[PDB]
Amino acid sequence: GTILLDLAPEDKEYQSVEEEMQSTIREHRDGGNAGGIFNRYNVIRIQKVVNKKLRERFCHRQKEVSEENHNHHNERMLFHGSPFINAIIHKGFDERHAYIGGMFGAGIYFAENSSKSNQYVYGIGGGTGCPTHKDRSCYICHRQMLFCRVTLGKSFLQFSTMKMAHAPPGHHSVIGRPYAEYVIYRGEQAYPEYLITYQIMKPE
Template sequence: MSGRCSQIIKIERIQNERWYIQYSAHKKDFRQRLGTDTEKCLYHGCPDDAANSIIDSCFDRNYAGQHGTLYGYGVYFSSNAAYSHDYTSTNTRGERCMFVVRVLIGKATPGNGKMKTRPVGYDSTTGENHIFVVYHDAQAYAEYLITYK
């Protein structure tokens, strides 16, 4: 994110026991079903009011489509922090928020804007080799929230 971020204000570890238990159950299921670990560490940028909601209530597919649905109507994550930065906005202090998230990719297929859910036999959709879209709220666990300028 060269030129976009000049100062990290804080990094907070997120701890939501209910959310973690649900995520762990999905992770175990994915590993048993697929015979491999498909967890990735990805980024999710958002405004700070959305960040507070995510911390309290998990990722919520009911908000899918607010920033487009190019690869499906799910929750979007990227391996490219600069890409996720484009979905942040500054608060009154000029700060932005980005999550570092554990995401269960499972079996992925290229997505498109007409997909309301993942196709049968797949767990997520992808786009541009760095974008991952999940369709189950417990398929992602926000581990850290980075606040930066």
């Protein structure tokens, strides 16, 4: 099944993941309501998700996609926040949890900004925050997010709300602009490469 492999802080791979996370923090339109108020994270663990079965499913789909995107699977590293991170790392992403709704339909959504994914760690709009304090801006409780390999193939650009069930004909993903939201409609188009444990930090 799934094995979690810790990365050591001295490892350039750990450093690369933390740098992508810290450097993509931005101020959000909701004034910090969903994800909290912070300028940086305290990254306290980075694990690689190792699952031969899940990896085989992802590579098999990459091969299907490359054939339709002129030998390119167009992979991007993107963040994903979710209260269901335990199911994802054990069973993989699953589009069946995505229903006709959402700004860009029944897909799984990813962000270039780690702070955007941090808004979804405790639910839509941050839910009711952490389980212990019910605080969307909790500095105590440890959070987790994923940094994923996402097979985008041929992306379709969308600039208004729609409720698509699948990507348009001949396409494999939707890049939606309400900052871009990257949407796939098959769970096997994302691999949960890194599981990051972190806190948001109080501003100084």
